[PDB]
Amino acid sequence: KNIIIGAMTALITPFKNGKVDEQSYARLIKRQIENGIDAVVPVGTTGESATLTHEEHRTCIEIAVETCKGTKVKVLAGAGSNATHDAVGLAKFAKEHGADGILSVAPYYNKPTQQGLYEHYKAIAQSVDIPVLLYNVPGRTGCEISTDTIIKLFRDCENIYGVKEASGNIDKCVDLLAHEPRMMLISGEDAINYPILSNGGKGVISVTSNLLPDMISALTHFALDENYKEAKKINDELYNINKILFCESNPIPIKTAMYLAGLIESLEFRLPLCSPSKENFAKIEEVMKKYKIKGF
Amino acid sequence: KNIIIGAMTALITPFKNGKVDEQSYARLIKRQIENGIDAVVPVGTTGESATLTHEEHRTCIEIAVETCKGTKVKVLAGAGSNATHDAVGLAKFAKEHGADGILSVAPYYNKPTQQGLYEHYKAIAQSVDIPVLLYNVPGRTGCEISTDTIIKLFRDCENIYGVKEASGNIDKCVDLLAHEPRMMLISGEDAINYPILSNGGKGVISVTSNLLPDMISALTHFALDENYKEAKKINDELYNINKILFCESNPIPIKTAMYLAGLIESLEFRLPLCSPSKENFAKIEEVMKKYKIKGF
Ligand SMILES: N[C@@H](CCCC[NH3+])C(=O)O
Ligand SMILES: N[C@@H](CCCC[NH3+])C(=O)O
Ligand SMILES: [Mg+2]
Ligand SMILES: [Mg+2]
Ligand SMILES: [Mg+2]
Questions:
Q1: Which residues are marked as site: Part of a proton relay during catalysis (chains A, B)?
Q2: A143 to chain B: nearest residue by CA?
Q3: Which of A122, A142, A174, B167 has the fewest C-beta atoms under 10 angstroms from its C-beta?
Q4: φ, ψ for residue A136 (rounded to 5)?
Q5: Which residues have C-beta within 8 Å of that of residue A35, sequence separation ≥ 6?
Q6: Which residues line ligand 1 (CB under 6 A)?
C-alpha cells in the first residue's frame, strides 16, 4: 500500500474580515515545510471544516497542494462528512486537484452503525485511487469505528492504509497493531504522541505542531528511528503545552497561541466558535513562555 | 412568550429510488394530524437531516406547512446546524415559508464553548420573530448546553421559549424547572416521556409517535391534564417499543418499523445510515406485534 506517515500538521484556517486569509494560509504552510514537517492536513477539525463553505474547503486544499509542489511535503486533504455522498465528493475533488491522500472523519451526529461505517468508507475508498486515512474521534462524532471495523476496511480496501486515533485509548492501539501490524496507526492526540509511536504507530497529525513544528517533527523522527529516549524527552517537555491547547475546544486555544505568537493577524473564529475566556487567554500566554516559538 | 407544546412527532423522511418520497411524506403527516398530534417536526435527527440536501430540507418543511394548513397542528421546523451561518439561514427560511417555530440542535462535532452556544443561539433568535426551541442531545453532538446557558438564553432572547432535552438526565430537568419554571421543557427521550411531563414538562418530540401517534398523544394529554395515573400507564406500556426503537441508532429502527407496518414503501436510508442487522430486524418485528398500529 501507498502511505502518508511521519510528522503532520492539522493546519489552522486563519480568517481576516470574515474571509479565509489565503496569503496567511500559504505563509503558514511554508513555515511548516521549513521546520521539518512531513505532511499537512488542510481543513480537518483543527481547520474549522464545519464552518467553511464547500467553496472555501476546496480553496484551502488547492492552496496546500500548490504550496507543497517541489518539496517532499505531502498533502493529506481533510475530506470527511457525515453524509457519504458529500464525503465521496470531497474525496474526488482532492484526488482530481492533486492531493496525496485524504483524511476522512467518522460521520458525526447521525451515529451510523458499524455496518454503515464500513459502507461509508468503502464508498469513499472505491471512488479514488489515493491513500485514505480513517479518523476516529468519538468525543466529537458520538461514534466509534471499532477495531474490527478498522481492520476489515484495511484488509478489504486497497487504499485504506491506517487510522488517525483521537480517542485516548492506548489499549485500542495495542489491539489494532497486535491484530493487524501492517496498518499505519497515526496519533491524533498530542499528549500521547510518544506512547503511540513507541507501540509502532508511524506518525502524528498534530495540533501543537501549528505552534511548535520543529519539536513535533523531531519527536516523530526520533521515535521512528527508535531513539526512544530522545522522543520521550520531547513528549515530556511538550506535555504542558499539549494539555493547555485543549483547555477549551480545539482550535480555540491553538489559534489563540498562534495569535499571541504573532503568526496570525487576528483572533477570528466563525461562530459557534469564539475566542477563549480571559482566564484561558492568560493561561495559554503563560504556558507559551516555556517554549521557543519559531517565526517565519 | 409564544410557544409550541404538546405531543409532537419527529417525522421520518421516506425515500423512494434515492429521492424524497413527497406524497408518502404528506400522507404520513396527515396520519399524525388525525391521531391527535399537536405539532410535527420535519427534518430533525429522526428525519435524517444530515443527509438531505439544502433543497430537500427546505422541501420537507414546505410539505409539512401545506399539509398542516387549515388544521391546528403546528409545524416546528428542524433548522439546526453546527455552522451558525447555516442555522440562521434555515431559521429565516422556516419563518418566510410559514413554520410556526423552529427546532435548533446544539452544534455537533465542533464542540463550541458555552459562550459560543449563547452567541450561536442569540444569532438565530435575533434573525426571526417566531419561537425557537433549543435542542440538547450530547450523545450525538459531543457538547452540552448547560442549565445556566439555557436559562440565560431563555431570559435574554424573546423567542427562545424552551428546550428539547434528549440527555437522559432527569436531575437536569429538575434543575431547569426549579430555577426557571416558566420555560417549556420538551421530552426528546421517549422512554422517559412521563417522568419529564410529571415534573412540569409541557410536551414531547417523539420518535415512537411515528408508529403510535395515538398512544403518544394520549400519554401527553393525560399528563397535561394531570391524570398521571393514566399517563404513567401508557408510558409503562410503551417502554418495550420505546427501547427497541433504539436497538440501533435512530432512525434505523423506526423506519424499519414503519416499513414493517406497511406505512412506507421502501426500507431506504441515505448512507452512512443503512438497514439494521437481521437479528435487530427480527427483534423490532417481534416487539411491534404487542401494539395496535393505526393505519391511514
Ligand atoms: N457544517 C456542515 C457542512 C460543512 C461542509 C464544508 N466543510 C458539516 O460540518 O458537515
Ligand atoms: N451533512 C451536513 C449538511 C446538512 C445540510 C442539510 N440539513 C450536516 O449535517 O451539517
Ligand atoms: Mg464560499
Ligand atoms: Mg535516521
Ligand atoms: Mg480535536
A1: 45, 109
A2: B140
A3: A174
A4: -110, 115
A5: A213, A214, A217, A294
A6: A 49-50, 52, 54, 57, 81-82; B 82-83, 109
